[PDB]
């Protein structure tokens, strides 16, 4: 999702104060394995992923000083985060309701959220190790010409890849064409 001004929601069990509008965003992604522990230079064998009926989808709210990581996130790339310190159980599954769990108005009711912590950092994995997953790094998804140009008016989600011809700004409403 893009970066803009966002409003959080009421924290669970905290004071009922309106969250301030703060610049932030969030991402959606799918896991590849269970809890993993560091071992020497690398990391130990991860725990098996729970065979749960819940979809292996997570939402990560980025805010505070973590906004600086926005420019290093792109679809189809393998990302592994790290939580410094001891491997405390129940840390990569869902937000802790007791701790700071503030979500935007469009994500408060989601059943799959994981707010990042400042001490956490993110690194990019190697190509050879996870080459199997990287095989799906084809062209980014895009709707057909018929779907984009059919009349209807159902649905407002489209995607393509074009080449800019001309640019012009509009002023009296602020608009750039």
């Amino acid at each position: 999702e893009a970066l803009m001004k966002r409003n959080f929601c009421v924290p669970p069990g905290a004071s009922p104060e309106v969250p301030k509008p703060a610049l932030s965003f969030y991402v959606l992604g799918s896991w590849l394995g269970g809890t993993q522990r560091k071992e020497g230079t690398g990391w130990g064998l991860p725990e098996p992923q729970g065979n749960d009926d819940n979809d292996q989808k997570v939402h990560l709210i980025f805010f505070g000083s973590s906004v600086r990581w926005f420019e290093f996130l792109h679809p189809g790339q393998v990302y592994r985060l790290v939580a410094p310190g001891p491997a405390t159980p129940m840390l990569f599954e869902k937000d802790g309701s007791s701790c700071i769990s503030r979500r935007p108005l469009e994500l408060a009711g989601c059943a799959s959220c994981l707010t990042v912590q400042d001490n956490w950092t993110l690194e990019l994995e190697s190509s050879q190790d996870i080459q199997d997953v990287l095989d799906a790094n084809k062209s980014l998804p895009e709707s057909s010409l018929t779907d984009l140009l059919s009349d209807n008016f159902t649905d407002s989600l489209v995607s393509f890849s074009a080449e800019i011809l001309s640019r012009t700004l509009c002023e009296p409403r602020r608009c750039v064409k």
């Binding site: 610049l23 505070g64 973590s66 906004v67 600086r68 990581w69 926005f70 420019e71």
Partner: peptide
């Protein structure tokens, strides 16, 4: 330098 205010490298 990646500042933590505007997200602009």
């Amino acid at each position: 330098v990646a500042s933590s205010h505007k997200g602009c490298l």
